[PDB]
Symmetry: C3
């Protein structure tokens, strides 16, 4: 059946606020593979990419039922796109077959939802 | 399998407007237990809490298929938090095990989604 | 059983208006003949809300389908119909005999939708 579901909406402006006000924010949210892509983007695209990843990982953590913390790190979750451009999640704590995700954007927001199934 | 799904996004300012214009708005949306929690919150927190509950119950009513009205009241739905802080719904019209919810917020919005499974 | 894919979309009403104004028969491109009949019956404001909602639903469906809108799936391959209570449901014959669930929501400035396709 369904193990859990998660939804997150993130304001891009906030991601810009949290980002600069640190100096380690993007690197804490993104994995090595994600960072490789992130560093090639323009300032504008970087914010959209980071906001999208942040939302997807937050949604995943909610579906997981614990949120980000001691039981689950942003580094434990990686978003990729298949050959059709569809995002999917790989998480070292469960089978990718049990996970579904969707990501969307508007000028000012990034949002994502995740559904985890019990196999 | 899946019986129904529901999504809702609610503008905090609209909630605050209705709460100011309407008599007993919080009392109409919240159960006794939620009201007890609501009344211990600051003015700002109250609006966020209320908007989140409203979004969650709206989402639930859409998944249930009846919407809020004669067949289902806001009073028939209660959101609780487990030991990890994860929200879950209690509605005696169905088993708690068949329901899954997720709630999110931004500065100006509250949003929620629900998935009800057939057991 | 099991979930085939999920999709989420948030669309800015102002952007739909911006696209509908500067473009050809934008509404005609997004909507099927039956949706158009419903569309033409609405006021200027309602048309924008209706179009944004249907657009969000088709985008969300395209994301659950896993390809997005394009060569593999057209806006015209997806139809949002209304049941006896005026609530939306999706018909996509291009989709194997699977079950499709959809939920649409609105705020003053946005339209949003989510879809779950079960295999
Ligand atoms: Cl946010
Ligand atoms: Cl990738
Ligand atoms: Cl997606
Ligand atoms: Cl926007
Ligand atoms: Cl549904
Ligand atoms: Cl609203
Ligand atoms: Cl009591
Ligand atoms: Cl949640
Ligand atoms: Cl906001
Ligand atoms: Cl948009
Ligand atoms: Cl439906
Ligand atoms: Na890192
Ligand atoms: Na709303
Ligand atoms: Na947020
Ligand atoms: Na959008
Ligand atoms: Na529905």
């Amino acid at each position: 059946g369904i193990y859990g579901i998660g939804l997150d909406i993130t304001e891009l402006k906030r991601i810009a606020s949290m980002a600069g006000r640190q100096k380690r924010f993007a690197e804490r949210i993104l994995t090595r593979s994600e960072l490789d892509q992130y560093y090639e983007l323009s300032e504008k695209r970087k914010n959209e990419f980071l906001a999208g990843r942040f939302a997807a990982k937050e949604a995943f953590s909610k579906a997981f039922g614990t949120g980000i913390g001691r039981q689950l790190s942003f580094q434990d979750i990686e978003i990729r796109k298949d050959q059709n451009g569809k995002p999917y999640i790989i998480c070292t704590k469960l089978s990718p077959a049990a996970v579904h995700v969707s990501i969307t954007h508007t000028k000012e927001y990034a949002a994502a939802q995740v559904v985890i199934e019990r196999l």
